[PDB]
Amino acid sequence: MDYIKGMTWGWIGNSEDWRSNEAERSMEEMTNLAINWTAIAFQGLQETAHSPDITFAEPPMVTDENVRWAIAKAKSLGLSVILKPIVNVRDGTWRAHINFFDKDVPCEPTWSQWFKSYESFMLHYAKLAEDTGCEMLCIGCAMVQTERREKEWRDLIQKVRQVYSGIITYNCDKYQEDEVTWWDAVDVMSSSGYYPIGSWEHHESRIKKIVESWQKPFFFMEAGCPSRLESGSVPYDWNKNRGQIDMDEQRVFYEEMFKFFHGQKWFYGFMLWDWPAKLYRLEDASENDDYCVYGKPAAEVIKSFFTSNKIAKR
């Protein structure tokens, strides 16, 4: 299994953004992080957390051609690719709340309905990932309230294996590394490393014990922090202190994360969050509140970490 030096590209997955002349320049600029991987991330959509139907590849979401382009462009840039189709909820609910009754009842949509819709979604992109030679497929992201549906997840993974021959991971949410009973069904364990400033040493200890109990490769499928006042205390909170710029907060987050998670032989690195298809101008970086590190001191932390000899050795 490769050590991942990664940046996520393309989120939220807007066809008009991905087809702009600006998208190619954005992906080229991302290579200056000294990454060898990118996660091509884009959304699918369902109306509510309790509705069974997932829409994908319809305006304003990415076309299959947009996706083929992003994968081919990344690979042309010498990057290995994780394809990362993510379901979002149109009403704004966090996808971790997607959930149905344990008991099938005639008056409600069922797990079986939602899983059929999720299978259509994920198998569509699994076939794309096969056709385009994606090195890895991420079959879900922080789907916390679905994870107890163990038979349905294992049945989905078996269908994925029949159409996709690359590496499979599932991205569990922050704090959830020990809560997935079906890690054995994927190749590589992964989680969202949005752990607050001051907690990384504790989480390195906690996660090491989980990964050694499973004896499987682990890496962070997401990790990052907005360049905002006190974002480092809640790096996952994309709504905290919008417009309140703090470059140094984001830098401190990255320096601590890499102090504790580096070269350990059980650890396979970082897919960072994230890098837009339409990138702001360098001159606007110092006033930008995004997760993106472009033009910010955290980018230099990432570059020196990814080019350092201990990490270049993995």
Ligand X SMILES: OC[C@H]1O[C@@H](O[C@H]2[C@H](O)[C@H](O)[C@H](O)O[C@@H]2CO)[C@@H](O)[C@@H](O)[C@@H]1O
Contact residues: its own copies, CB under 8 A: 48-50, 91, 93-94, 96-97, 99, 101-103, 105-108, 144-145, 148, 173-176, 179, 194, 234, 236-237
Joined together, the tokens standing for residue 144 give: 């916390």
Q: After which residues is the chain broken (C to N over 2.5 A)?
A: none
Closest-by-Cβ residue to ligand X is 238
3-class DSSP assignment, residue 138:
strand
Select the residue interacting with ligand X from 66, 88, 132, 288 (CB under 6 A).
Answer: 88
Contacting residues for 170 by C-beta, under 8 A, at least 6 apart? 138, 139, 140, 153, 180, 183, 186, 189, 190
CB of 207 to ligand X, least distance (A): 17
Which of 223, 121, 216, 128 is CA-nearest to residue 169? 216
Q: Are the beta carbons of 144 and 176 closer than 8 angstroms?
A: yes
Nearer to its own copies, 85 or 140 (CB): 140
Binder among 71, 87, 142, 156 for ligand X (CB under 6 A):
142
Comparing CB distances to ligand X, the nearer of 224 and 311 is 224
Phi, psi of 173 (to 5 degrees): -75, 160
Between 52 and 226, whose beta carbon lies closer to ligand X?
A: 226
Centroid of chain to Cα 116:
23
| 195 makes contact with ligand X (CB under 6 A) | no
Nearer to its own copies, 3 or 111 (CB): 111
Q: Which positions touch ligand X (CB under 6 A)?
A: 11-12, 86, 88, 141-142, 192, 222, 236, 238, 273-274
